[model samples]
Target: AMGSVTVHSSEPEVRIPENNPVKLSCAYSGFSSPRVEWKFDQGDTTRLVCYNNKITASYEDRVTFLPTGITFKSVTREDTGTYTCMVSEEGGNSYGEVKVKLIVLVPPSKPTVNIPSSATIGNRAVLTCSEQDGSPPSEYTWFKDGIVMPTNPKSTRAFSNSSYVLNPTTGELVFDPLSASDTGEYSCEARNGYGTPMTSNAVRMEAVE
Candidate 1:
């Protein structure tokens, strides 16, 4: 329900990532030619710049409304919150209420990985993976065929100091010694427990046969 006006959408909770789009429309079944205004419950910013028959949303690049009154193009986390649509007329205002909840999901981006593309059998291959954006320092895990590839033996497994730590000059596996049997899709999964899980998108390798 919009303020004094009623608008209905299939989805009450609107969710999107940064730089996406969004739209909100007001429709009143009872009122004839109802005028609508949009108010943001999150704070003092008016998301809609123009309020009349239909409201024109603020932040034109990020949001807008169609003739159907659907919101579009939401690219910011701050843009998410409760949205109230109110309708008014010349004499008085009679509006319905519809709450638009926005959720922003940001997936991991800017991943840089270093893997020795050329390696001989029985030699160590070090693959270093890093990402530019991740909350909580990011947990690093290596995988082969969706199964965990342990760097340390079960008897010597003790990694709790940080989210991730390299062997640091120690004679670690570095990476499985190059073998024709080990040449396949290797994935480095980076997760922060706060944001989305990111994978290295499968770095393939081969041994010099």
Candidate 2:
């Protein structure tokens, strides 16, 4: 009898935050042209065979696979649970399992403020803020024009001594009761530790008098 092969994920516990996107993958070392099948642990969701690790139509625009692993683009709240990957061959059956947990997050976007054109001086105007999506416990930061609004140069750069990388410790920031003096282009940046930070085009938060 042929020996059965087993598959495993690099990380046993996979975490995907809501309103965010992530890549999930499993690997098998000794399988030869095996037929891979994906299945949901709880629901009766039987995914297609994983040929070349390509994502299925059900996960289109939301999930993808790579040479080294699988990817989930634009993750959502509905995607959370244990996923199983099984491989079958002429000789034996190989299997791999991965559990994914999705968490909802608030993206650092959808904040706009425009003062009334006929507003009086010294009056306060409120700026509405919101986020599209992101990982659990997201970080939001508010930047005024070219500079960080709060002016935290020291903390802006994390691990600066090692690489030329600039990682902000903060994200999803807000300021209310804005005055005419707060007129300028504002920017919002979002990111996870895995990939590059996602940034919004500089939004013109102009205040009219």
Candidate 3:
């Protein structure tokens, strides 16, 4: 056998606080001469942090390459994602790869709610709520005049007078068609199972006279 490239990570999954320094270990062996690179992915999106054993220009400010691993000077909320470490022989084909996930833990922050002050009866409407800061994202709940709304309006009797769909995962409350009973002060809550849950400001939504 001439030479082979193999890689391993000290930690396959990492959880660290936001804005903290961290390192991802990617030690390789079995090759006297080898080339390396690190690829990053946030869901379907992808970016190359290192190629040919060097950190890319865009990540040079807070990123560095070590002979044995990759270093992050400071990680932000956007840094929470997956990374693949790859290596190959200097003159060989088919480099091997290892994938790892990194999550930057951040408590939920007060969410921002978007709603109409007044909506016409029998018209479709949508309300949105989202917290710009949080790890693992957040599940949202909508409130009407300080009363908690059900995730499914059709299943609840209290909401029998209303026609809307409240999606906790997507922060979307879509009213198929506004009705006279839809008027009320609306608010939202965001929670990610970490720290304290957050609340949003109340805003009134009135059905047109």
Candidate 4:
């Protein structure tokens, strides 16, 4: 009977912003001298990264291989996915495997603001902000006529203004019983910590009977 192999990774998950560098580490025990290989899975395709001390042609320019690790230079969103490391007896069956997930974060683009052109007075009105792409999700901030809305009561003056309420986490503005005071030029900002904040275009809102 052959000895069972055990494998471990320094990190089970790695996250970095786009254009950043990342390193994946794998170590194994049980074979006298084992051949190691790395593979990447993106979407439905699985491809070789490095094998037996040799970097594959596809990754030779952008990747560096160490005895038990691999480094990626300037990773992009396309680099996010699962990476597998395998260790086996030389020219024989694989004895151990480890998988690590990598996430390359991208900052949100300028969001699209959604608001009705007019809201009936005394009716509830809702405004929304959304971004199509971002990693780790994005938080939102809203502004009215160039005034920043406050998320916390102690943070700013907009907290005391009571015509409407804002949800900073979801970018929703709810106006209960809309009134003339609720009308404004509204805009939203999206941020995910991966990059600088992105601001959306402003749109006018009117209260009508």
Query: Highest lDDT among the candidates is held by which one?
Result: 3
- Model 3 per-residue lDDT tens digits across residues 1-209: 45556788888998887888899888888766678899999978899989989999888999989977888889888889988998887777546777878999898999988898988899888998999677878988799998898876876568887899888877888887899889899999899877788999999998985
Q: What is the lDDT of residue 120 in candidate 1?
A: 74
TM-score against native, each model: 0.45, 0.41, 0.77, 0.71
State the lDDT of candidate 2 residue by residue for 9-32, as single tens digits. 776667654556666566765566
Best by TM-score: 3
Model 3 collision count: 0
Q: Please identify model 4 stretches exceeding 4 Å from their true place.
A: 42-45, 51-53, 91-94, 121-126, 144-181
Candidate 4 structure quality by residue, lDDT tens digits, 114-209: 987999988789999878678757788888897887664334575454457778677888887787877789898888877788899899999998
lDDT of each: 0.56, 0.49, 0.86, 0.82
- Candidate 1 is scored at a TM of 0.45
- What pairs collide in candidate 2? 18-103, 19-134, 139-171, 139-172, 140-171, 140-172, 140-173, 141-171, 141-172
Q: Report the CA-based lDDT of candidate 2 relative to the real structure.
A: 0.49
lDDT ranking of the models: 3, 4, 1, 2
Model 1 agreement with the true structure over 87-168: per-residue lDDT tens digits: 5554554546566666565555545666556667766677666664542345667665666655653344332211222431
RMSD to the hidden true structure, all candidates = 10.2, 10.7, 3.2, 4.2
